[PDB]
Ligand binder design. Structure first.
Ligand SMILES: N=C(N)c1ccc(C[C@@H]2CCCC[C@@H](Cc3ccc(C(=N)N)cc3)C2=O)cc1
Lengths: 7, 252
């Protein structure tokens, strides 16, 4: 969903 | 982005590259950055559209790490209609916000992926503590003095400035209104070569903070005086002030 990314 | 570091699109899936062309279609130039809020809607800065461009002459490219080098999993869309905030002022840049509707074949345009994702809009009551470190990204200049934009995506980190400190006085007498936000690197005497800051070309891009476990959009790179200038913060549009506007103008 929104606000998520890859770290 | 002045200072900062090179970043891969996957670290900021919500960054949009907006390109535009010229008379006779000789080539499409990088206009401004954008922020992906929903599948077919991306926000940007109203000032970027001061030349009144015909929508079909605006291309939003998602999932792209290098400014002009096409990405492995990018998504290019043409603009159907772009709404520019009516109360936007060209002198003061007050109300520097705009919406770009993406043209698609279905109800969905931008297909969420590992490199393409939306930013969570801020809650109406979002009150982030002064000096919280938020981050920004963009393909803009590394130096406001530079004649070139960034060949690749970059990210920087700025500290949110207290309300009081975001005043005309503190910004060389330019008009700072209640729709503006101030953030800027606050380091001195460190090991780094440049103060972190947005710059010409980053406009329309996102200033995002971590809120309730998710990256929340807080402001839109609007304007400033130079880039990475000692004791001068950068101005960003208060997205919270336009949550209402955003919801209202998102018409299919
Ligand atoms: N009086 C005003 N309200 C005013 C003052 C200057 C500008 C310059 C212009 C307007 C268009 C050209 C680029 C732009 C981009 C930019 C973005 C971020 C930063 C930063 N945080 N250092 C610097 C520059 C800018 O600030 C616009 C408006």
């Amino acid at each position: 969903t929104c606000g998520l990314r890859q770290y | 982005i002045k200072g900062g570091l090179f970043a891969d699109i996957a670290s900021h899936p919500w960054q949009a590259a907006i390109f535009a062309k010229h008379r006779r279609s000789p080539g499409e130039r990088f206009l401004c950055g954008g922020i992906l809020i929903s599948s077919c809607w991306i926000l940007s800065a109203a000032h970027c559209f001061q030349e009144r461009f015909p929508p079909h002459h605006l291309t939003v490219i998602l999932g792209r790490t290098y400014r002009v080098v096409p990405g492995e999993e990018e998504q290019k869309f043409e603009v159907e209609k772009y709404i520019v905030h009516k109360e936007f002022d060209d002198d003061t840049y007050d109300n520097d916000i705009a919406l770009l509707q993406l043209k698609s074949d279905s109800s969905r345009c931008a297909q969420e992926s590992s490199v393409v994702r939306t930013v969570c809009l801020p809650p109406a009551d979002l009150q982030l503590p002064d000096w919280t470190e938020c981050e920004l990204s963009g393909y803009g200049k590394h130096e406001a003095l530079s004649p070139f934009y960034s060949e690749r995506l970059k990210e920087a980190h700025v500290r949110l400035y207290p309300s009081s400190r975001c005043t005309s006085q503190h910004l060389l007498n330019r008009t700072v209104t209640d729709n503006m936000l101030c953030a800027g690197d606050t380091r001195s005497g460190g090991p780094q070569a440049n103060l972190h800051d947005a710059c010409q070309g980053d406009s329309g891009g996102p200033l995002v903070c971590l809120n309730d476990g998710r990256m929340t959009l807080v402001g839109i790179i609007s304007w400033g005086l130079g880039c990475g200038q000692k004791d001068v913060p950068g101005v960003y549009t208060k997205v919270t002030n336009y949550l209402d506007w955003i919801r209202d103008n998102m018409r299919p």
